[PDB]
Design a protein around this ligand. Structure first.
Ligand SMILES: Nc1nc2c(ncn2[C@@H]2O[C@H](COP(=O)(O)OP(=O)(O)O)[C@@H](O)[C@H]2O)c(=O)[nH]1
Ligand SMILES: Nc1nc2c(ncn2[C@@H]2O[C@H](COP(=O)(O)OP(=O)(O)O)[C@@H](O)[C@H]2O)c(=O)[nH]1
Lengths: 47, 277, 185, 126, 93, 430, 430
C-alpha cells in the first residue's frame, strides 16, 4: 500500500480488502499530516 | 516510660557489632551451652459555593517516573557506593587462634612485636600472604599484630619478597572493597611501605592495576579537613586523610612503576595527570 | 588601599604564619579546597590551593573587586613549590598612559602573545621549592613600550603551595635579605 | 526546670534561650530565644510564661513556640521620677543604666535609653 | 471542627512598576471598602497537616516578605473565611 | 468551553448511550466517528462535547464506570458503542448489590484511584475546563456510592469549577428496590454539601408523560432516556451555538441559587405532543410557555401548587423575537403571583438561541427552583425513620462497617433541609 | 562505507536470517538476487551491505559459523536462504556441547582459521572498511566461546575499525540452560575488553512487548527476531539513506560512551501498536516520544526508575520537523530532571533520516546508557558465586583444560564493572 519513500499511492491496490471510502480517508489524512507540499525525492522513482 | 540513651559514638556501639561477626568473644572461644469505617463528621460542605479563588488540594497521589504528568518531586533510591560492607572472615584469625605463628606482643608506650625466631629464615610464601590477609581486622589484638607484622616483614625481607607479589593481590583487593576508611588508610600505608621495600617490585605491580586502582577512584575526593579556610589541623600526625594518602600513593606508584605505568593509571583513574612527562 | 602607606624596602601581603593569613584575600573555590598544612621538606605551615579545574579555584586580593592595591614597587617575589601539575597567576598593572593591562603566565601556554589588554606567556618551574622574581617594569617596556607606575591586583590559581608574597624595590642577594624572608631547607 | 503536661521537660538558660527536651533521650525539639536570663517557667492552659532577670515576662504558645512580651518593670532601686512642665499623661523614671517613659493612664511604656555599665542618678525635663 | 485548606493573598505590583504606570505612591489609605485598580488576587494550597497556627505563620511570612501588601484571607473547608488587614497602612508589624 | 461527562451504574450508562446518540446526531457524527454534517456551524463548536483525534475521527469526553461489566458490554455492543474510547471503561469484578456501604467503602476505594486517574487525564487535556456533568441513580448501589465518592474527590480536586448532577430518585407510589430510603438519604446528605446544582427525576413522572402527553401504546426505556437526553442536551445548547442573548452554566447557577443549600431544581421540555394532535396546533411562543408551566410536563411527582417558585430559567431555541419571550415571562409572573416568592422582584431568567433541534421549528427547556420539593424529602425521611426504629435490614450496612452516627447525622441534616424550605416558603417581609 | 556481518551459533544464524530478510526487503532485492526496487535511492548505497556479482545477482557480505550444520541446513532452506554464497557457510563435525571451554579451546582453535580466511577474503575486498557487526547469544556454547574468540582475533587484525555486537542475555526469571552463569560471566569478561558497543536483549522483555503491546495470542521466535531485526536495521539507517541531520556509528559511540568500559546499552523501538488500537491514534512526534520513553516498551529487565541516564540517543526516520523533536526532548529532560545525570547539561542526541521502514510513515529507535544495567551484572555474579563456591559443574570445564583462576578473574572484573557504574550513579557536582 506504500512506496519506498512512504507515500500512499494513487490508484486502488490489487485485491485490496478496504473499500474506496477508507482509501480516500487515508489519502486525505496523509495529505493533512505532511510537512512539505511535495516529495523532495520524486526524481529518483522508476517504473 | 522507659528511657533509651543515645548510645552512639560511645564505648558500647551496636554499629561495630553488625560488621565483622567473628568479633566480640573472649580470649577463648564461646562458653559451653547453658551458661472499622467510623464516622468522622462532615469534612467539607463547599457545594453551591463554587468560586475562582478555590483550587485543588489533593492533586492525585505520588508520581510515576516516566508518565505524562511527570515525576514530581520523586527521586531514585541511592545505590550506596559509600555504604559500609561486611568484613569477610580472615585466615589470620584462624592461624593466631590456632597458635602456629612465630610472634607475641611486647607491651609498652611504643608497642612492638617480639619474635620467637629470626625473621630472615621464615618461608615468606607461607607467611606474607597470611599477614596481608589480617589487615582487614578491626578488633584488638589482631589489628596491631597484623599491620605491625606486615611492616616488620616488609622491612627485613630482602630479595625474597619479589616472587610473593602474585599471591598478595587478593588480600589487597579484598581489604579495599570493605569501604571502611580506617582499613583503607592502613592498606594504603602498607602499600607505600611495600613499594620501596626492595627492587623491581614496582614493575611487577603494573599488570595488577586493574584490580587495585578501582577503589582508588571512589575515595580520592573524600577529605576529613572540615576546618574553614586557613584553620590548621592538629591531627596531622595520625595520617587519617584518605585523599592525600591516595594521591601520594598514586604518585609513588607512577614514579616506581617504570616505563608505562602512566597509561595504566590514566586508564583506571580518569583525572590523573602524568608526573614525569 | 596602600596609597597612603609608607612603601620602601619590602612590602609583603601574604604569610602562612599568623592568626588570619587570608585576612585581605577573597576565595572563589569550586571542585577544590584551600587549607593550611604542615610541609614535610621545610617543617613549617604552608597554604595549599588544589583543585581539579585550573580556572575555577583561585584566591584574589583585594577582597572588594572595586579596590586597588596601589603598590609602586617594581619587583614582585613569590615563594611557590611545584606539585608536578598545572599552575598559573595574574598581575594587573597601570602605566603612565592610563591603561589597565594584564600579565598572565602558565605552564600550559603554547605561544607568547601580545594583545592590547593581555600578554600571555609561558613559564617553567624547577624541581622543589622555588622563588620567582618578577620584573614588572622590564616586561611592560618590552611588551608595550610604556613606563610602569603601579600594580593594582594579584591573583593565584591551583595548584601550588605558598608561604609568602612580597614586593621589593630591587634585586637582593641571598645574604642581604633579612632572616624572616629567606627560606631554609 | 518545669515539666509539661505531656511529660517532656522544659529548660531555661542564662543566655536567654528556652528549649524543649524529650523525656526518652534528651534531644532538642523546639527552641525560642528571649532577652535576659530565664528565672521562672509557668504553665497556662493555652501556653507558657517565661520570666527573666531583667524583669521581662514573656508569653509563649505551645503550638509552635513563638514568643511575645507583655511586661516591663525595673529591677533595682528607682532613683527619681519627674513630670514634664504642663503635661501629666506621661512621666519618666531612672533606675541603673536605664531611662524609661511611661503612660500614666494605661501603665504602658514607649521609650528606652540604655548606657550599659553606668548608673543614672537624676533626670529633669527642659 | 473544620480545618484550613487554602489561604488567599492580595498584592500590589512592585514599586518601580507602579511608578512607571503613573499611580501615586501615597494616598492608598482610605475608609472605603474598594481596592486599588492594580491589586491582584493569588491563592496557594496548604498541605494536609496544616492547621490554623502554621497557616497564620505563612500569612505573616507573606506580610513580611515584600512591600505592597494589605489584604489577607484564610479559607476553611466549611466554606468560611476570615480576613487579616494592617491597622496602619504601609507599616508592617 | 468544553464539558466532561461521567456515567455511573446501569441507569447512568443507559441514559448516557442515548445522550451520546442525540449529541452525535446534532453534530452529524457518523457512528464510525467521521464528520458527515451539512453546515460549518456544526463543526465550529464540536470541541464542546468531542475531543479531536488525529485522523478522521472524534472521541467523546466521557468516563464510564460500573462494578460489573454487563451493562457496559451491552452498550459497547450497541450501534453507537464503537465511538467510545476503549481505555475509558473502568470496571471491577463483583457487583455493588444495591448496597451503599459496599459501593462506597469496599469496591469504591478499590477503583476510585483509577477513575480519578482517567478524569485527571481528560481534564488536564482541556485548554479551558467547564464544569463536570454526572448522571446516576440515587436508589442504586454503585451509582449512589461511587458517584458520591467521585463527586467528593472532584470537589476536593476542582473546587473552582461547576458541579452539576442529573439524578434518578425513588417514586412515591412503587419502589424499585426494598432498601431505597437508606441509599437515598445518605446520597442526598453527600450531594447537598458537595453539589452546586442537582436535577431530580421520577420514573413515575416519565410514565405519566408517556401515557398522557405522547399516548404511546408500548413505551420503552429508550423513550424515557430520550426525553432525559433532550433536556440535558437542551440546557447546554446556548453554550455551543450563537444567539441573541447568550447564557452559561455558571450564569444559570448565579441566577437560580439564592442560598447554597437551596440548589435542587425541577426540569421540563415543551414541544411534547401526540401523533394525532400535531395537526391541531401550530408552534408559537405562548403555546410553548403554556406547556412549559403545565405540571403535566414536569418530571417530578411534587406539584407546584403546594409551594412557591424562588427562581426559574427558560432557554429558548429558534428564530424568535425577544418581545414575545419577555412579555410571556412577565404575563406568567403577573397572572400567578401567589405562587412566586414576593421578596424577589423578578423570578424568571430568559435566554434565546438561534438554532433549534432538527425537525422542530422551536423548542424550550425549563429549569425550576420550587419549595414543593421539600415534601419528597419529607416522605423519604419518614420512611427512613420507620425503617431505622426497627433497624430494618441494618445488619448489611453495619456488617460492612458504617457507624450508626452516620445515619443519624444524615437524617438530621435532611430534616433541617426540609425545615429550611418550610421556613422560606412561609417567610414574610414584616 | 561497508559493514561485514558475522552470525555465530543457533541464535545468531536465526536472527541473521530474519535480519537479511528485512534488509533485502527494504532495498527491494528479490530472493533470486534480482533488483526489483522502485527508487534510485535504493540502488545508490547497496554496496554498504552487498557485493556485486556479475549478472543481475547481489550477494550479502556475511559469514555463517556453527559447530553442527543443522541450523545452517534450516537457514539455507529458509525463504531468503538461497541468496547466501555457498562458500560462506563454515561448519565442523561435532557440537559445542553447550560448554564455553569446549567452544573456545577445542573446536574453536580447530575451525577458527577457516573463518578468519573467509573474513579476511571479505574484508580485503572492500574499498574502505567500516565496522564489523556480530550477532550471538551469551548463554550458549559455540556462540559465546567462538564468538568471543573471533572477536579477539578481529580486534588484533583490525584494531582501528569499529566492533559492534548484539547479544542475548539470560532472563532473570527462567533459565534456558543450567550452566548459564559461567558462560555469561566469561563472555562479559571478553566483551568489556574487546567490544566498542554491546547491545543486550532479554527474551522476557520481547515476550512482554508482544503480549502487552501487540496482544499476540501465540507469539513465536519469528516475531522476536523481527523486533531485533528492526532495531539492528535502524541503527545503520543513516549510513545508507539521505537525511536532514546525518549520523554514523562512530558519532553514536562518541556521544554515548563517556568512559571506555561503560559501553553496554539498552534498546527500544517505538511504533509498536495493535491493529485494533491503530484506528484510534495517529502517529505524531509527541506520541512516539511518550511511547519511546515508557519502560513498558524497553528491551531490558532493568527498569530506568532504579537508575539515572548518563546519555541517550534517538534516531528518527521520516519527513518531520526539527522543532518538534528539539522541544519534546527538552520537555522530557526538564520534567524528569532527577533521573538525568546532572554533570552533563544535555544527555540526549537526536538524528533525523528521510526514509522510513517500509509500511510505516514514521519510526524512531532509542539507545540508552543507564546505570540500572548494574542490577543484571550483580544478579549474574550472585548466581555465579553460588555455583562456584560449591564447584557445581566445574569438572567439565577443567577437563577441557581451563585453570580455575580464569573464573575468579572474570568474576572480579564483572564486580569492578558493577562498582564503576555504582560510583558514577552517585557522583555529585560538589
Ligand atoms: N429512567 C431510567 N431509570 C432506570 C434505568 N435503569 C435503571 N433505572 C432505575 O434506577 C434504579 C435502579 O438503580 P441501578 O441503576 O440499578 O443502581 P446500580 O445497581 O447502583 O447501578 C431503579 O429505580 C430503576 O428503575 C434507565 O435506563 N432509565
Ligand atoms: N531472541 C532469540 N533467542 C533465541 C533464539 N534461538 C535461541 N535463543 C536463545 O538463546 C539461548 C540458546 O543459545 P543457543 O543459540 O542455542 O547457543 P548455541 O548452542 O551455542 O548456538 C536460549 O536462551 C534461547 O532462548 C532466537 O531465534 N531468538
Amino acid at each position: 500500500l506504500r512506496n519506498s519513500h512512504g507515500y500512499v499511492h494513487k490508484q486502488r491496490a490489487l485485491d485490496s480488502d478496504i473499500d474506496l471510502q477508507t482509501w480516500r480517508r487515508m489519502r486525505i489524512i496523509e495529505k493533512r499530516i505532511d510537512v512539505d507540499k511535495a516529495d523532495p525525492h520524486r526524481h529518483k522513482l522508476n517504473h | 516510660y522507659e528511657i533509651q540513651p543515645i548510645l552512639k559514638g560511645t564505648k558500647r556501639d551496636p554499629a561495630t557489632r553488625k560488621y565483622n561477626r567473628a568479633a566480640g568473644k573472649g580470649p577463648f572461644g564461646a562458653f559451653p551451652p547453658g551458661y472499622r469505617f467510623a464516622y468522622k463528621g462532615t469534612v467539607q460542605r463547599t457545594g453551591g459555593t463554587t468560586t475562582s479563588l478555590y483550587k485543588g488540594r489533593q492533586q492525585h497521589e505520588s508520581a510515576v517516573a516516566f508518565t505524562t504528568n511527570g515525576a514530581g518531586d520523586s527521586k531514585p533510591p541511592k545505590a550506596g557506593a559509600f555504604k559500609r560492607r561486611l568484613i569477610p572472615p580472615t585466615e589470620f584469625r584462624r592461624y593466631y587462634d590456632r597458635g602456629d605463628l612465630p610472634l607475641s606482643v611486647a607491651h609498652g608506650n611504643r608497642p612492638t612485636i617480639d619474635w620467637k625466631v629470626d625473621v630472615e629464615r621464615l618461608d615468606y610464601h607461607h607467611y606474607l600472604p597470611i599477614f596481608f590477609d589480617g589487615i582487614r581486622e578491626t578488633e584488638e589484638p589482631y589489628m596491631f599484630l597484623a599491620r605491625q607484622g606486615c611492616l616488620d616483614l616488609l622491612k627485613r625481607g630482602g630479595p625474597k619478597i619479589l616472587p610473593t607479589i602474585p599471591q598478595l593481590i587478593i588480600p589487597i583487593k579484598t581489604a579495599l572493597n570493605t569501604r571502611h576508611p580506617e582499613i583503607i588508610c592502613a592498606t594504603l600505608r602498607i602499600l607505600q611501605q611495600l613499594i620501596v621495600s626492595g627492587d623491581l617490585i614496582g614493575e611487577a605491580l603494573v599488570p595488577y592495576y586493574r584490580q587495585i586502582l578501582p577503589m582508588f577512584n571512589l575515595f580520592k575526593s573524600r577529605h576529613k579537613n572540615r576546618a574553614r579556610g586557613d584553620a590548621i589541623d592538629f591531627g596531622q600526625r595520625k595520617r587519617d586523610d584518605v585523599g592525600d594518602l591516595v594521591i601520594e600513593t598514586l604518585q609513588l606508584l607512577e614514579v616506581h612503576g617504570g616505563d608505562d605505568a602512566y597509561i595504566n593509571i590514566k586508564y583506571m583513574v580518569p583525572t590523573y595527570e602524568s608526573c614525569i612527562f | 588601599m596602600f596609597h597612603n602607606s609608607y612603601q620602601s624596602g619590602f612590602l609583603s601581603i601574604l604569610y602562612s604564619i599568623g592568626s588570619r593569613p587570608l585576612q585581605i584575600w577573597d576565595t572563589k573555590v569550586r571542585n577544590g579546597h584551600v587549607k593550611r598544612i604542615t610541609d614535610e621538606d621545610i617543617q613549617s605551615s604552608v597554604l595549599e590551593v588544589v583543585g581539579n579545574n585550573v580556572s575555577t579555584c583561585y584566591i584574589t586580593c583585594p577582597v572588594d573587586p572595586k579596590k586597588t592595591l596601589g603598590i609602586k614597587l617594581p619587583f614582585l617575589v613569590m615563594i611557590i613549590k611545584n606539585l608536578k601539575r598545572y599552575f598559573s597567576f595574574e598581575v594587573t598593572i597601570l602605566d603612565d598612559k592610563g591603561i589597565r593591562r594584564r600579565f598572565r603566565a602558565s605552564n600550559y601556554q603554547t605561544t607568547t602573545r601580545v594583545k592590547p589588554f593581555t600578554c600571555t606567556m609561558p613559564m617553567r618551574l624547577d624541581e622543589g621549592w622555588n622563588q620567582i622574581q618578577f620584573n614588572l617594569a622590564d616586561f611592560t617596556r618590552r611588551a608595550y613600550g610604556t613606563n610602569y607606575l603601579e600594580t593594582l591586583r594579584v591573583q593565584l590559581h591551583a595548584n601550588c603551595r605558598v608561604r609568602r608574597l612580597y614586593f621589593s624595590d630591587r634585586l637582593y642577594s641571598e645574604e642581604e635579605l633579612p632572616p624572616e624572608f629567606k627560606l631554609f631547607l | 526546670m518545669v515539666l509539661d503536661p505531656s511529660g517532656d521537660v522544659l529548660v531555661g538558660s542564662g543566655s536567654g534561650e528556652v528549649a524543649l527536651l524529650s523525656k526518652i533521650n534528651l534531644t532538642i525539639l523546639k527552641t525560642v530565644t528571649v532577652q535576659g536570663s530565664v528565672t521562672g517557667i509557668c504553665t497556662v492552659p493555652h501556653g507558657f510564661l517565661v520570666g527573666t532577670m531583667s524583669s521581662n515576662v514573656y508569653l509563649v504558645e505551645g503550638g509552635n513556640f513563638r514568643a511575645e512580651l507583655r511586661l516591663t518593670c525595673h529591677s533595682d532601686t528607682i532613683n527619681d521620677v519627674v513630670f514634664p512642665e504642663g503635661l501629666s499623661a506621661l512621666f519618666a523614671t531612672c533606675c541603673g543604666p536605664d531611662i524609661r517613659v511611661w503612660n500614666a493612664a494605661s501603665s504602658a511604656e514607649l521609650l528606652r535609653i540604655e548606657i550599659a555599665g553606668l548608673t543614672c542618678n537624676c533626670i529633669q525635663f527642659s | 471542627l473544620s480545618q484550613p485548606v487554602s489561604y488567599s493573598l492580595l498584592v500590589l505590583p512592585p514599586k518601580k512598576e507602579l511608578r512607571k504606570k503613573g499611580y501615586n505612591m501615597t494616598d492608598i489609605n482610605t475608609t472605603s471598602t474598594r481596592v486599588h485598580p492594580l491589586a491582584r488576587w493569588q491563592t496557594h494550597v496548604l498541605k494536609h497537616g496544616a492547621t490554623y497556627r502554621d497557616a497564620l505563620d505563612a500569612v505573616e511570612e507573606a506580610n513580611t516578605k515584600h512591600w505592597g501588601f494589605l489584604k489577607a484571607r484564610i479559607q476553611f473547608s466549611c466554606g468560611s473565611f476570615e480576613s487579616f488587614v494592617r491597622t496602619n497602612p504601609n507599616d508592617p508589624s | 468551553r468544553e464539558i466532561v461527562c461521567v456515567q455511573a451504574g446501569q441507569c447512568g450508562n443507559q441514559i448516557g448511550s442515548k445522550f451520546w446518540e442525540v449529541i452525535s446526531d446534532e453534530h452529524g457524527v457518523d457512528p464510525t466517528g467521521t464528520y458527515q454534517g451539512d453546515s460549518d456551524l456544526q463543526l465550529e463548536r464540536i470541541n464542546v462535547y468531542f475531543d479531536e483525534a488525529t485522523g478522521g475521527r472524534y472521541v467523546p469526553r466521557s468516563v464510564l464506570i460500573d462494578l460489573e461489566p454487563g451493562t457496559m458490554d451491552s452498550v459497547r455492543a450497541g450501534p453507537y458503542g464503537q465511538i467510545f474510547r476503549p481505555d475509558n471503561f473502568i470496571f471491577g469484578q463483583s457487583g455493588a448489590g444495591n448496597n451503599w456501604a459496599k459501593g462506597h467503602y469496599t469496591e469504591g476505594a478499590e477503583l476510585i484511584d483509577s477513575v480519578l486517574d482517567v478524569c485527571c487525564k481528560e481534564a488536564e487535556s482541556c485548554d479551558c475546563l467547564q464544569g463536570f456533568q454526572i448522571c446516576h441513580s440515587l436508589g442504586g448501589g454503585t451509582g449512589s456510592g461511587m458517584g458520591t465518592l467521585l463527586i467528593s474527590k472532584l470537589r476536593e480536586q476542582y473546587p473552582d469549577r461547576i458541579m452539576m448532577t442529573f439524578s434518578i430518585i425513588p417514586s412515591p407510589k412503587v419502589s424499585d428496590t426494598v432498601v431505597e430510603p437508606y441509599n437515598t438519604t445518605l446520597s442526598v446528605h453527600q450531594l447537598v454539601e458537595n453539589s452546586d446544582e442537582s436535577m431530580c427525576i421520577d420514573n413515575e413522572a416519565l410514565y405519566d408523560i408517556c401515557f398522557r402527553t405522547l399516548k404511546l401504546t408500548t413505551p420503552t426505556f429508550g423513550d424515557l432516556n430520550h426525553l432525559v437526553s433532550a433536556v440535558v442536551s437542551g440546557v447546554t445548547c446556548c453554550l455551543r451555538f450563537p444567539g441573541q442573548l447568550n447564557s452559561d452554566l455558571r450564569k444559570l447557577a448565579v441566577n437560580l441559587v439564592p442560598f447554597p443549600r437551596l440548589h435542587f431544581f425541577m426540569m421540563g421540555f415543551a414541544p411534547l405532543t401526540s401523533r394525532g394532535s400535531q395537526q391541531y396546533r401550530g408552534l408559537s411562543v405562548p403555546e410553548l410557555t403554556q406547556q412549559m408551566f403545565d405540571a403535566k410536563n414536569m418530571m417530578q411527582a411534587a406539584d407546584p401548587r403546594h409551594g412557591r417558585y424562588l427562581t426559574a430559567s427558560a432557554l429558548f431555541r429558534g428564530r424568535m423575537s425577544t418581545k414575545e419571550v419577555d412579555e410571556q415571562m412577565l404575563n406568567v409572573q403577573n397572572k400567578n403571583s401567589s405562587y412566586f416568592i414576593e421578596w424577589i422582584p423578578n423570578n424568571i431568567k430568559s435566554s434565546v438561541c438561534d438554532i433549534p433541534p432538527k425537525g422542530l421549528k422551536m423548542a424550550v427547556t425549563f429549569i425550576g427552583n420550587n419549595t414543593c420539593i421539600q415534601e419528597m424529602f419529607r416522605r423519604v425521611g419518614e420512611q427512613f425513620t420507620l425503617m431505622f426504629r426497627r433497624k430494618a435490614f441494618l445488619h448489611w450496612y453495619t456488617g460492612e462497617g458504617m457507624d450508626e452516627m452516620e445515619f443519624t447525622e444524615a437524617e438530621s441534616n435532611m430534616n433541617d433541609l426540609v425545615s429550611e424550605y418550610q421556613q422560606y416558603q412561609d417567610a414574610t417581609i414584616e
